[PDB]
Every structure is written in C-alpha cells, then in structure tokens.
C-alpha cells in the first residue's frame, strides 16, 4: 500500500543514516537496484546486495558515514546529508537535455531515468539526453 516505493526507499535510507545504521532493508525492485547502482558507484554508500526475508527479496544497503568528532556531539557527518524526491507520483517532473540542473554547484548529484537508462546530471550531458528527474542527493 505504498504509493511511491522509490521515495519510500530514499526516505528509508534517510531515516537510518540519521541514527547511523550499519545497513537497512528496502523491498527489492529492478528499478530500485538500478538506482542504488548510482548512489554506491558515486560513493554515497558502500553498496547493496540481494538478501532474503520470508522469501521476500529486499536490498540491504550499507551506509557510508564519516569520521568521528571531538568537542561536544561526536556524531559523524553523513555522506548523504540531503536526499529528496523530485518527480513525485503527484507531479511527474520532466526535463530535456538543455533544462538539466546542477546539484549544489557540481558538488551533489541529480539521478534521472532516461531511455538510455538511469544516469546522472553529468551523464546526461555526456550522453546528451533528458528524462524524468528522479531525485537530488548530497
């Protein structure tokens, strides 16, 4: 009874990172993993892999955080501080290749599905294609 499994996933990651879990399980899908194939390959995480709960395929996602800290509040910095879904089931948000954005001035990344597959901002420039802007991460 999830309206948007994707924005759920991201939200599931986001809730975890904020207490810093080892991994987390999201229900598995071909398009989900295909997206994770980007977070991890761009280093927001360690990565993922196909696990099992009661016969139900999930994806365990191991989370890259960062160094400890002196002073009050030793809590590490996230590698993912900011992730939020852009094109929602409520509003489907599409760009062409010229309308493509740049997250945090080249610092962050925009994940987007296109007909050349799930790529990034840079990659859509490199490939010269647009698609549905799925989310933005930093």
């Amino acid at each position: 009874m999830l309206t948007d499994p994707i924005a759920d996933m991201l939200t599931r990651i986001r809730n975890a990172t904020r207490v810093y879990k080892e991994s987390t399980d999201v229900p598995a899908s071909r398009f989900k993993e295909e997206i994770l194939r980007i977070l991890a390959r761009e280093g927001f995480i360690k990565g993922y892999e196909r696990v099992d709960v009661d016969g139900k395929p999930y994806l365990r996602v191991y989370l890259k955080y960062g160094p400890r800290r002196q002073g009050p509040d030793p809590r590490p910095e996230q590698v993912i501080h900011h992730i939020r879904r852009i094109s929602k089931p409520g509003r489907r948000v599409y760009v062409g290749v010229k309308e493509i954005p740049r997250v945090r001035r080249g610092l962050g990344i925009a994940i987007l599905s296109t007909s050349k597959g799930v790529l990034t901002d840079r990659e859509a420039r490199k490939l010269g294609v647009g698609g549905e802007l799925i989310c933005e991460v930093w």
Binding site: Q70, G71, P72, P74, R75
Partner: protein, 229 residues
C-alpha cells in the same frame, strides 16, 4: 594485561536499565540481567590502554573522577598512588570551563596552608582561626586531590560515565579526551576511551583502577608493588 582474569568478578552489570547504544557491547542476559561481553572489553581495553601509555610517556596529567560510594575512596588510593589529581566529593560545576575562578579558591586554601604554621594567627580572636580551619577543613574536603592540577588535563578518568555526566560534559566540551568505565548503566559515543565493565562492585573497579595506574606508573618509569584494597 590479565586476560580472562577479568572474569573474577569484573563482568556484566544491570537489568533493563540499559541505554540501547551499549548493545554492541552486550553478550546476553541471564538472571533476567544484562551482561557484558568480555572479549569486547579486551579488544577495546587493548586499544584503550595505548592512549594512556602514550600520554604518560608524553608526560602529562589525567583527571580521575568518581563520587559513587562503591568506587569512592578506591579512587583516592590509586590516585595519590599514581601521583595524579582526583575528585572524591561533590563535583564542582565549571571545574574545567570555569577553572580560572575555581583556581582563585585553590590558591585560597594554600593561603591557609602558609597560615597553618604562621606567626600571623594567635593574634586572632579564636573563631577567626576556626572560621579559617572550617574553611580549611572545607577547602580540604572538596579539593584535596585538586591542587595537583594547575593547567588543563590532556584526558580524564571517570568511574560512572552517566553519573558524572556533568563532568563528562565540560571535558567532552573543551576537546579534552574522556576515558572511563561504562556499562549497562550508560552509553558509548559520549566517551572516546571506554571500559566496558561494571561501574559498581569494587572488584570490577579495583582491577581497572590499579592495573591501569600500574601500566601508567610503569610507562612513566619504575615498577612497584600492587596497591591497597
């Protein structure tokens, strides 16, 4: 040092009082009672010791603290014994962060120390000197382990980590490192250097009290007998 010897009774502590952060340090609970994993200690205790060793053979002070009656005086032995500062009584606020003001009081007891054997007194109106010695006995009671520090400690020692959480703050704050004895009573992450063992029974305490102070004293040079129990 003393590997499985810490089983003597140095092991698990509380019952469902646990901060859930501490769970990576736990083995299981029998007797309905949360119990520590011991190899967990040693793996960490190994890593823990090195720090102090380093700082010892870098030649600088360490602030020993606990006020719980169970570990109260067992501090005072291994502290004088180590030749390093301690705190045995109600823990002064700003003991670090307010230091310069606290110091005005530290130098205020030592005004009484000169005044102890002095021509000045007697030629006092007899409460005036008893005032001073109540002040003295007072100045005494709260800081007898304090004067051993005239500039900010490079690490600090705590028996009960969330007991002293007051202290553990200023310390945590000033960028001063925190070494201490944590259990089911308390949590990780609020402490850099942790002893995952009981904070209560003197037995668990005495081991990590002296046998640290021992590998202290030796790292600073010379090796002595085991200390008073």
């Amino acid at each position: 040092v003393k590997e499985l010897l810490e089983a003597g009774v140095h092991f698990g502590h509380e019952r469902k009082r646990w901060n859930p952060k501490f769970a990576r340090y736990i083995y299981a609970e029998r007797n309905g009672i949360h119990i520590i994993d011991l190899q967990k200690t040693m793996e960490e205790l190994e890593r823990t010791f090195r720090f102090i060793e380093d700082l010892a053979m870098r030649g600088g002070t360490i602030l020993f603290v606990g006020t719980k009656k169970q570990a109260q005086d067992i501090v005072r032995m291994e502290a004088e014994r180590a030749g390093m500062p301690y705190v045995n009584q109600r823990w002064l606020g700003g003991m670090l962060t307010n230091f310069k003001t606290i110091s005005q009081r530290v130098h205020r007891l030592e005004e009484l120390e000169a005044l102890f054997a002095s021509p000045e007194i007697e030629e006092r109106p007899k409460k005036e000197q008893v005032r001073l010695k109540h002040e003295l006995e007072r100045l005494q009671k709260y800081l007898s382990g304090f004067r051993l520090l005239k500039r900010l400690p490079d690490a600090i020692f705590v028996v009960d980590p969330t007991k002293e959480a007051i202290a553990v703050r200023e310390a945590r704050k000033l960028f001063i490192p925190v070494i201490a004895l944590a259990d089911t009573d308390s949590d990780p992450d609020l402490v850099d250097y942790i002893i995952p063992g009981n904070d209560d029974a003197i037995r668990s305490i005495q081991l990590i009290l002296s046998r640290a102070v021992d590998l202290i004293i030796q790292a600073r040079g010379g090796v002595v007998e085991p200390s008073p129990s």
